[PDB]
Amino acid sequence: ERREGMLLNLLIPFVLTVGSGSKDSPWLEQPEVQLLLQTVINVLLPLAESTSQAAYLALKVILVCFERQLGSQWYWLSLQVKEMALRKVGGLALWDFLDFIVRTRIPIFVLLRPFIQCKLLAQPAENHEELSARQHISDQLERRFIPRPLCKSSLIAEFNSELKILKEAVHS
Amino acid sequence: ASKIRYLQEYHNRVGTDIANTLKYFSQTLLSVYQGLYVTLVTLLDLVPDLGQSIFYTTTCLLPFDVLSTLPYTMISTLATFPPFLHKDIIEYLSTSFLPMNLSASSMLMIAMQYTSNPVYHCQLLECLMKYKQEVWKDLLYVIAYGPSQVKPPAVQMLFHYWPNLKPPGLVCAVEAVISLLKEAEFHADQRLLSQFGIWFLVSLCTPSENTPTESLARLVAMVFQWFHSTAYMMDDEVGSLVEKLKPQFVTKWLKTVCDVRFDVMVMCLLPKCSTVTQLKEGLNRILCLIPYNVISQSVWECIMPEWLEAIRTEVPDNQLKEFREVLSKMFDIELCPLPFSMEEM
């Protein structure tokens, strides 16, 4: 009943302020990055739609801003994301998270490529809303390179815009 | 079949009885599951000699649909097992690779991240080569999208198994070059990454009219950022070798791309985290490019009006002093090795 406000008012703004601004962000130490990742996943794994969307946005922000700080922590993150996909934690916008992962090709994309390609796409679609996202992900997987990343500025702008949109949608 | 249930219960409680049950499973399978693999995957978490006996059952079963998921999970063991089990896992993978598609790339992402011994991933690549026609794309994916500490071993193995990648002296390759060059900027074996990236750029990147505009623009932007990053590096023996080899390769490639594709060369140097800081960074990048005589009179006439207009408009009126030490360093004939006179400048 208070994690949503923390995610949308403190955690996401904090990660945006600290991680962005430079290629490397040594302001935050490794234990703090671990704690933030645990907090986000605990909002995710052990859910409301808006809460899930905020959690996934925070997960994207932490993955991108704190990519270097994560270091040897990609296999566990891949396992957690695989569990999220198996549980259908997001329900909606989980496909948006996977589409983001495929777009940015973040270090977890190489680990999650087999599950998304051979396994996840094998499962039939339920609704047209998820069908469109699944088709977009499949198109982005093969025969589509689209090198979008550029000095992390576009990603941070996207995160800030999505945060503003979600903040405006929550109060309304 | 009750032995499987006993094994599951023992695992839930926790090789006295589990090892004996695994041996029973192996000897039962040898004489002649689908329902057994649910505990076989759990055997990976069971272990945290004994691991060799655990994987001997899998080695018996593999020659004996879902098999496509078998290697990755087994390869996943490399990320949790103690260091001594890595050799046994590599040996089992090599031995049982004969009965053994993209997941193998992700395999390297593990094998090149947790195992410090070159021999492990070298043998993995050797056994993948005999069953994968194009293993270079796996390493390209690893370098382009994987994190650091995975890029160095992947680059080293890529250059080891492909001696043709050394010049005398498509999209995935461009992304790999971009990542390899970004490694140097992130650093500011770090210099080895820059050296290998420049070698690969000279080898398998020839600008032409057939090159996609976006790919060439990204490549040139990363080249300029890498030049700026390498400018401030300290001068050591490796530093001296880098600073001596770079005019031979990077300057030559920039000259070639400018001669062939001038539009991208101009577009990359245009001004296009604060706006003032970004303009200062771009101006410093141009100033760093200047000593290598990359900028000709055409480049100057094409880029300087836009930079001055951006300074006049985008930058506020805070005395503009922040840019002074840059601009005063770019508009001096003595400071810059440009053959430009006052009329030309």
Curated annotation (Swiss-Prot), chain A:
Q: What stretches pass through the bilayer?
A: 47-66, 92-112
Q: What is seen without this gene? A: Knockout leads to severe apnea and neonatal lethality. No mice pups survive beyond 24 hours of birth. Hippocampal neurons show decreased NALCN-dependent sodium leak current.
Top-rank lineage group of the source organism: Eukaryota
Q: Where is it localised?
A: Cell membrane; Cell projection, Dendrite
Q: How is it modified after translation?
A: Phosphorylated on tyrosine residues.
- Tissue-specific expression: Expressed almost exclusively in the brain. Expressed in hippocampus and ventral tegmental area neurons.
Chain's role: Auxiliary subunit of the NALCN sodium channel complex. The NALCN sodium channel complex is a voltage-gated ion channel responsible for the resting Na(+) permeability that controls neuronal excitability. This complex is activated by neuropeptides substance P, neurotensin. In addition, the channel is inhibited by extracellular Ca(2+) through the Ca(2+)-sensing receptor. UNC80 is essential for NALCN sensitivity to extracellular calcium.
- Note the subunit structure: NALCN complex consists of NALCN and auxiliary subunits, UNC79, UNC80 and NACL1. These auxiliary subunits are essential for the NALCN complex function. Interacts (via N-terminus half) with NALCN; this interaction facilitates NALCN surface localization. Interacts (via C-terminus) with UNC79. UNC80 bridges NALCN to UNC79.
**What's the family?**
Belongs to the unc-80 family.
Q: What is this protein called?
A: Protein unc-80 homolog
Q: Which organism is it from?
A: Mus musculus (Mouse)
Which taxonomic lineage does the organism of this UniProt entry have? Eukaryota, Metazoa, Chordata, Craniata, Vertebrata
Portion of the full sequence shown: 2773 to 2979 of 3326
